[PDB]
Scaffold this active site. Sequence first.
Site, PDB file in Angstrom:
ATOM      1  N   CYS B  91       0.837  -1.229   0.000  1.00  0.00           N
ATOM      2  CA  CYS B  91       0.000   0.000   0.000  1.00  0.00           C
ATOM      3  C   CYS B  91       0.865   1.269   0.000  1.00  0.00           C
ATOM      4  CB  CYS B  91      -0.925  -0.009   1.207  1.00  0.00           C
ATOM      5  SG  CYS B  91      -0.087   0.429   2.750  1.00  0.00           S
ATOM      6  N   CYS B 256      -3.341   6.981  -5.688  1.00  0.00           N
ATOM      7  CA  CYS B 256      -3.170   5.504  -5.586  1.00  0.00           C
ATOM      8  C   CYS B 256      -1.826   5.110  -6.212  1.00  0.00           C
ATOM      9  CB  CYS B 256      -4.324   4.742  -6.232  1.00  0.00           C
ATOM     10  SG  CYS B 256      -4.349   2.972  -5.836  1.00  0.00           S
TER      11      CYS B 256
HETATM   12  O1  LIG Z   1      -1.738   3.084  -4.010  1.00  0.00           O
HETATM   13  C1  LIG Z   1      -1.733   2.165  -3.221  1.00  0.00           C
HETATM   14  O2  LIG Z   1      -0.757   1.502  -2.924  1.00  0.00           O
HETATM   15  C2  LIG Z   1      -2.983   1.808  -2.603  1.00  0.00           C
HETATM   16  C3  LIG Z   1      -3.356   0.702  -1.889  1.00  0.00           C
HETATM   17  C4  LIG Z   1      -4.693   0.863  -1.522  1.00  0.00           C
HETATM   18  C5  LIG Z   1      -5.110   2.065  -2.023  1.00  0.00           C
HETATM   19  N1  LIG Z   1      -4.071   2.634  -2.679  1.00  0.00           N
END
Ligand SMILES: O=C([O-])c1ccc[nH]1
Lengths: 335, 335, 335, 335
Positions: B91, B256
């Site tokens: 994450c 993300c």
């Molecule tokens: O971008 C990421 O690693 C992530 C995990 C869950 C939401 N975003």
Amino acid sequence: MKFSKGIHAIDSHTMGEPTRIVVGGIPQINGETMADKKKYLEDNLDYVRTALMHEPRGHNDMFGSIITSSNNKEADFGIIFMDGGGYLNMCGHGSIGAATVAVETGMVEMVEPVTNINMEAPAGLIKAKVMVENEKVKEVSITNVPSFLYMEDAKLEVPSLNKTITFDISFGGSFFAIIHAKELGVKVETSQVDVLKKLGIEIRDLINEKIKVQHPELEHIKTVDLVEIYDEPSNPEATYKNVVIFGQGQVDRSPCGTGTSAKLATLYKKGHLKIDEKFVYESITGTMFKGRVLEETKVGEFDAIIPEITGGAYITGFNHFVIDPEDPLKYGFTV
Amino acid sequence: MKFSKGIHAIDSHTMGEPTRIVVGGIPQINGETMADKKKYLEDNLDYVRTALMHEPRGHNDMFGSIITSSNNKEADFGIIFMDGGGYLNMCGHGSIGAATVAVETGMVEMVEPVTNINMEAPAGLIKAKVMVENEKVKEVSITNVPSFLYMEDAKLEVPSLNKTITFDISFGGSFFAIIHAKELGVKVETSQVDVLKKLGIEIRDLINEKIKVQHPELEHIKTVDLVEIYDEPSNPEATYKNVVIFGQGQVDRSPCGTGTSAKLATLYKKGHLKIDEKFVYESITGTMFKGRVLEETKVGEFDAIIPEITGGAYITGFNHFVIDPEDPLKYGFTV
Amino acid sequence: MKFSKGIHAIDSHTMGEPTRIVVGGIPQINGETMADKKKYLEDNLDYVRTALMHEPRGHNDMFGSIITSSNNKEADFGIIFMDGGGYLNMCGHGSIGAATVAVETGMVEMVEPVTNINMEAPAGLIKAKVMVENEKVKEVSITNVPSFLYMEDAKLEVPSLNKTITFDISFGGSFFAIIHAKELGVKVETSQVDVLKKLGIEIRDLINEKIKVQHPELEHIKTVDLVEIYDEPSNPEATYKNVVIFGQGQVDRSPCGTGTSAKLATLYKKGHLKIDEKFVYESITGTMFKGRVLEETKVGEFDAIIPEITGGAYITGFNHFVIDPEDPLKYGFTV
Amino acid sequence: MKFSKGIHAIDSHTMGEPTRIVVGGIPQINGETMADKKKYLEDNLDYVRTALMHEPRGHNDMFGSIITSSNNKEADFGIIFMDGGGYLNMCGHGSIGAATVAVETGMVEMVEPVTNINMEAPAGLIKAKVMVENEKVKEVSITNVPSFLYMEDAKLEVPSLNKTITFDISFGGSFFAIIHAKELGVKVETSQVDVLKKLGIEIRDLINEKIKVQHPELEHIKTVDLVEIYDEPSNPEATYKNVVIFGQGQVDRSPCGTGTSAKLATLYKKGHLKIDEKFVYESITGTMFKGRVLEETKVGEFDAIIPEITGGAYITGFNHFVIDPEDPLKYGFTV
Ligand SMILES: O=C([O-])c1ccc[nH]1
Ligand SMILES: O=C([O-])c1ccc[nH]1
Ligand SMILES: O=C([O-])c1ccc[nH]1
Ligand SMILES: O=C([O-])c1ccc[nH]1
């Protein structure tokens, strides 16, 4: 590290609906009365408020309160309420919280049987008695404003698709609007109530068009937040199940004190039992407040009562907030 | 007071998307590898997890991580990721968080120019370099898994009303699904994205029916979380704007990382510039990650790259969580 | 504010004698055994130790430790011991302190009758049993390293005042010298604390160089770091009472667990009180521990007694230490 | 855990001499003036004071205060002063400490050049100016109560050792006795701290009863609670250096602001150093304050000098104190 500002809060929650109680980090709030103390928190601050209530610290449905000095001589302390949508005048779910944490920690000396504590709030001085069992708080009874029914029946437009079928209005420290679910396709469960939050909040805007009424005597509210959906429980201890949409666009995880301290007007005069009864009143979360009439103050216009509502708060951690003067979202970021 | 359990966490946030970093309160996690450490947090605990991630403490879109011991000899420490929907393998948004807080506090000695720290996580050992300007962290570059494109085009049913018009799929440590907004009536602003969260999550369930694909080599994921909407930015620094629906039914306030560490596969081979470029990639909140290809590992099947994603975390308070063995919601209560 | 590092601790006290327990201020600390964990402190850090133990944070006297990972099987967690003067191998009042907190804060789950914790001295693995009375901890029995008499009688030196002759020296997890309060002519009252501290560390020094001093195992030891004064009691509930001078020139406010586990070790071999018998050992402050002889055992030279001692810790606040990298005294003051 | 009360504090230190600043541990404390705020401590509580100042939390020496509300106009907040021995009317190093923290934590907004704070002694309203260098505090100038010489020369008593004759006594926000270190024959080194403490409070006692002792205003005073030893410096950057014995038998680690504001008050009237002139006053520890004479003024009997003294505080951790209602030493130990 860094920090610039550092605020000390106790996390509470009362039958869901969290409450952030700011204890230290702002030592004095100038105002003579708690009303202008509040005004002095509005402007000047109201970004401690945003930092705490909005993300990434708080969230949509987040709430809290500042414990401050009294200035009023009766005893105890002063509080100011606050949420994602500014500053609320009175917030049972939070008068509970405050009282519970005040006794649970050393901020007031605990009696043992039931501690009476009277906090200031920018509203009228508020009266909570704290049932404590030798060691700890069990639950708190908060005695509410003179509350009343307003104008039985009434109904406006409502889109998709019925057109159709009547509602009601009443006080409870603040106004409210009452819907019997049948109005259409609601179920009031954790599962959904995305349609409920959206079709509930849209009424707060729809009415505000007309059927405007200031509470006869004093002059603040004018019109509408604080709607309500209800119909038949799922906790057998209770009676009815319902929730309240308010402030910016949140739902109450608590049954809503100001809620129950309203529409308990219908319990008398509209049938349904009369006086000094039980009422056990539960939210979406499936947790319950106890409401009881007490005195029954007719007053010239309408008919009113001074209710007693009982809930219970539990501390959910101690918080040392700190605001990064680099962090772009140092204050309240929203959705 | 009371309490039974007391957990020490540092609140972070990285371009929105909060991260609760549990530092003290569970001194040892038995497992040999961080993978079985995680398994040993699953069962046994996973209610520290619920207490922290669910209400009244956490919220729907809340996230966090435990810093634990290494056992692996390379240096530093171990972490395990966690959210409202269980335990995530990797994450970014959080590898940032962890690294930032590790240096900002004394948990690792800061270099001055850029601190390299390698954390364990139940996934592969993770590589973050921390740009620090004399005093403080500025931002962190986290080098991601070998990520790739999967099968260009593809599309399933979609209700109301189009029927119509194609999508795509790719890796990024986890799979994803790519939608060009035009698919219908989305706008990706704070204003709404209630329709976006609901029409996005319904695809996560719709596909999972078929076009199932395990990443060729290793065997965990099988199928689908982690969709994505994109189209044209509003921050002029950027390019595109997009967000990601995942875990239980949340949206990412961050762009993300695992997101950007995917679909950067299209930047090469599919046209669009080639290698060691800028990409600045922003979420709904209106905040941006920087993505860059680096190495470009073809591998026999498909074509892949080992990306470098840069974000920035800011500490948002220090937390002493405590769980009331009376509080009915002592662990995770949800909606 | 800007702080560089921040250490999270729990203030304890056990029959006086404060203990600062560092919990998750630093995430992982390498050394295979708890002895070379201690070395990996000491050589590195040992200015967390000074920052915490010396003024303005700590004081002369003042004690504490770090909860860490195990590495070692069966042990629930690590533990190191530290004070103003340096690092001790084992601490009764400290192991009481650690075990109490470990249960009290829910770091380990509480059994209800008697909660069995294994910590990793380093002296050696120690077993503590935490008596908990439904709700809370009542007392902790810590069973200590195989303790023994060493040398018998032994000889001394003159400086302040006059020559004088016999005493004795013994092991009890740490090494010791026991004086009847005749040899030197004090009496163990607050009145004279200062002459005890000063003539205490003067002997601690000038028996060292000099004497043979070694534990047949360990082969890191060969140092008698504590001097123990004793004389007949004051409280009739107790037998002979002591105080222990050690680390830089500090007294123990507790009867010293490692101290008593050394005294009743000279006894039994000395005659007097013959296994499973009550011993109630008191400090200066007026506070008492309960010692008893157990499973005998030998050590590669001489027959030993493997004792148990029971005391009681209380938590005295939670501490978020931070060090200003400007503050001239950011680390240990001294005086 | 169960704790009854919990007090939130900030650990400071100013040129040694720790200060525990209680922030929002208790919400409101009544007494109209800060003098009868102090009385409403003392008579009530004064076991928050013992709990905090005495072991196992505090130590002999150890100092601190409570930030409260003002009541008084113009003042930013209240402030009281407390120590192991009781309550002081005014504390230089303490007012430095309060002002530093007040700015540092963002309790008040920081001006950038020089941040002007008014606190409410109670001795009298004091003005502190906090030199802040863009980012952080550099030093605090606190301008003290109108200070003066009282009695001139004055006479003494014999116990330990021999009669001996002259000294002098003076006001400086608190009352004082100043000795050249000839009268008694010490020299102000760590070597002899103990003889100073003991012969210090023995004079503090046996000049009292006895002497006239009164401040023409206040009419609560009539007590010389501090004895001040002085002799020529060691560090050439400084002039004559002192240490102050007070409250139960504790030394000051700081040069004592109220102490120096009393010394240079005897000077000027004594001749020597004649207004707006440098004074660099050092303690035992080696730490120095900077005093200078200002606006002269008289007091209803005799001409005074209204001094300013400059020192520097640093925050040394944040403290969540809790008291176990089982712990035998839940409040102040002593020794
Ligand atoms: O971008 C990421 O690693 C992530 C995990 C869950 C939401 N975003
Ligand atoms: O019940 C109440 O008092 C309340 C206020 C806001 C939401 N609920
Ligand atoms: O109680 C003990 O073991 C101890 C060691 C040093 C001081 N006390
Ligand atoms: O610095 C001072 O003012 C002071 C008072 C007592 C000890 N120091």
